[PDB]
Design a protein around this nucleic acid. Structure first.
Ligand code: MG
Ligand code: MG
Ligand code: MG
Ligand code: MG
Ligand code: MG
Ligand code: MG
Ligand code: MG
Ligand code: MG
Ligand code: MG
Ligand code: MG
Ligand code: MG
Ligand code: MG
Ligand code: ZN
Lengths: 123, 175, 138, 36
RNA sequence: GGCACCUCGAUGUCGGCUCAUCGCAUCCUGGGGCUGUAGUCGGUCCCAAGGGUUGGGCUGUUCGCCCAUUAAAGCGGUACG
RNA sequence: UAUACGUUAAGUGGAAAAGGAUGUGGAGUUGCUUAGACAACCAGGAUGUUGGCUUAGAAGCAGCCACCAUUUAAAGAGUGC
RNA sequence: GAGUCUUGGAGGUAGAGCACUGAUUGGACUAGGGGCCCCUACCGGGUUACCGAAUUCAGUCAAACUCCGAAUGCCAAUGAC
């Protein structure tokens, strides 16, 4: 448990900037779909659209004790980091809908994350 | 982990009954079920809770302590709804039919083969190319389906005979 | 086929094989090798029979180091003969091995390859061996 | 395939014991074998 | 083949005949697993000793070759019974 | 049919070796791990991309570039069938 | 006469080692040339991947090899029991 200290102290600066974030389903992720969607994110902005999937709940509990006290109940749940570190997120909401409706990637248990104090219905 | 450490609920109509020498029985909406256990092992039940208290660790105690729990699980499941297993039948004309209570199968043999089940288990036939056994316990339907399958084992060169409801057989080539 | 060019005499007592190995009981010309846990008479064909396999399995990356050498000669009388009336005719050469002597050696290959090669060579010899690596302190 | 030395061939051969004997069972029945 | 412990005030050896009996490392019949087994025939391995296991030509012959059959024409011990 | 503590489950004891193996009793060395370990179940396992290459795609194992880096949550551009 | 304890001798076995006689493993140096070619035409040189006398580095053996070397056994001495 050495490098885990490193990553849990690194992600502070990562989570201390954004406003809006959204959650991705864990399973039913096609590497073909994964590369197409990550190249789509590539053609929009940088990799700031997180796909971090080494994300057991304890990094959440040791990272977001300051703000966003909701992920604890989504611990035993399909989790995949995806945040917004660029201009106001609406186009990412459109990509999310057109990726998550019925084709090759399921929404499932997705409910979004917090802007300042909110759970669902992002605009 | 271990399977002899999990928990087991008890539905409403399902009623277990403890007795001396650890010979638990069950009364349910589908029949009774009695099964004696090992005398040494301790069985203890609470409302919607099953417990198997194990004495000092040994080589055979860690085995019995899971065996009894698995058996109680199978028992409560069978008395709740029961088990079943179908039997696909490919043939090139191999067909089974019904006759009273027994079973008859016209496999490629030169005389009809008769199969009769014991009491407490029934053999239903939904169509002339499928057999489905139904019963309370699990070992009973298991043995009956095995004895029905062992009339005509599936030939590997081409699917021919009795086979389980969902299974893959290997295939060679003949010329 | 290994054998000495010249020798003093051509017949000789069979000797005895009690004790341990006087020397040669440490791998230093290489990295790995097989040790001897018992005492026997390694012949002249068993050595090359093991050597061909040991060098064929490997990819000639590392080179092998045979340490023993058939020196002592042994004889055998012709068949269907009574006892007595002289000593027999020389037949072949052998090599005396005592518990603890390092027989073969490999160096310049990896560890798993060396282990498997030495194991494949150990099945052609009449003794029970064990795999020993070079002393680390030197 | 009876032989006094049984050991898996492919990666998916298991090794079990029955009645005090050593058996190697697999899915490809060319590999099934029993010691002694 | 080796040795020379027993038998020199005596045991005489090979084939065939009459009669057999035992072992299994099974020739046939019985039950199985894998197969480079489509079927009919085969191969190799496992269990199995209950019964069965030929008539001639040549040679003193054991051995051996050949003819015609047979489900099969087993290998050995018993002072090479 | 003494006292005390252990070992063996084969009737080992109460006839053999090379070699084989999640039998069992010990003493160690040693990696990972309630930032969560192994199993099991729910996931996917190719993109300047099969790219320079070859009988036919060889598009994974005609068979030769260390047939490479990338998208990265991750891929040998194949572990085998 | 005998045993034992002190004291002194002769003698190269077990064991070890390479100081001599031989057998030998791998490196450095590999001399002087060896075959090929520049052409040894009449030089020298790249390899002789040297066949190899030297030496050296280390590493193994020996009933008819010793720079060494016991425990026993043997021969006496003056004292004691
Ligand atoms: Mg030395
Ligand atoms: Mg005599
Ligand atoms: Mg004598
Ligand atoms: Mg007598
Ligand atoms: Mg007489
Ligand atoms: Mg048999
Ligand atoms: Mg005539
Ligand atoms: Mg006779
Ligand atoms: Mg006899
Ligand atoms: Mg015994
Ligand atoms: Mg000596
Ligand atoms: Mg000497
Ligand atoms: Zn297999």
């Amino acid at each position: 448990a050495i490098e885990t200290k490193k990553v849990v102290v690194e992600e502070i600066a990562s989570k201390l900037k954004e406003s809006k974030s959204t959650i991705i389903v864990d399973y039913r992720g096609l590497n073909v779909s994964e590369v197409t969607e990550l190249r789509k994110q590539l053609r929009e902005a940088n990799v700031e659209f997180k796909v971090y999937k080494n994300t057991m709940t304890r990094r959440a509990v040791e990272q977001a004790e300051l703000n966003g006290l909701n992920d604890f109940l989504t611990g035993p749940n399909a989790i995949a980091f995806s945040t917004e570190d660029v201009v106001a997120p609406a186009k990412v909401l459109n990509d999310f809908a057109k990726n998550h409706e019925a084709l090759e990637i399921k929404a499932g248990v997705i409910e979004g994350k917090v802007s300042t104090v909110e759970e669902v219905k992002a605009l | 982990s271990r399977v002899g450490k999990k928990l087991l609920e008890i539905p409403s109509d399902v009623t277990v009954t403890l007795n001396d020498n650890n010979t638990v029985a069950v009364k349910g909406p589908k029949g009774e079920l009695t099964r004696t256990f090992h005398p040494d092992m301790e069985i203890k039940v609470e409302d919607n809770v099953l417990t198997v208290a194990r004495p000092s660790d040994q080589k055979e105690h860690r085995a019995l302590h899971g065996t009894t729990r698995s058996l109680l699980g199978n028992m409560v499941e069978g008395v709740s709804k029961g088990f079943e297993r179908g039997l696909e039948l490919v043939g090139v004309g191999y067909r089974a039919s019904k006759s009273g209570n027994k079973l008859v199968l016209n496999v490629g043999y030169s005389h009809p083969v008769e199969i009769v089940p014991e009491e407490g288990i029934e053999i239903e036939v939904p169509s002339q190319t499928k057999v489905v056994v139904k019963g309370t316990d699990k070992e009973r339907v298991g043995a009956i389906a095995a004895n029905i399958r062992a009339v005509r084992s599936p030939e590997p060169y081409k699917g021919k005979g009795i086979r389980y409801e969902g299974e893959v057989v290997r295939r060679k080539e003949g010329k | 086929m290994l054998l000495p060019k010249r020798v003093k005499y051509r017949r000789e007592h069979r000797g005895k094989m009690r004790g341990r190995a006087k020397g040669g009981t440490e791998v230093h010309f290489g990295e790995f090798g097989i040790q001897a846990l018992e005492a026997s008479w390694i012949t002249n064909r068993q050595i090359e029979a093991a050597r061909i396999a040991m060098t064929r399995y490997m990819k000639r990356g590392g080179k092998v180091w045979i340490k023993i050498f058939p020196s002592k000669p042994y004889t055998a009388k012709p068949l269907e003969v009574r006892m007595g009336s002289g000593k027999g005719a020389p037949e072949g050469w052998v090599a005396v091995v005592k518990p603890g002597k390092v027989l073969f050696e490999i160096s310049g290959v990896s560890e798993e390859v060396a282990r498997e090669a030495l194991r494949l060579a150990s099945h052609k010899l009449p003794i029970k061996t064990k795999f020993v690596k070079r002393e680390e302190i030197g | 395939k009876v032989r006094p030395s049984v050991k898996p061939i492919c990666e998916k051969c298991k090794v079990i014991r029955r009645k005090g004997k050593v058996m190697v069972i697999c899915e490809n029945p060319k590999h099934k074998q029993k010691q002694g």
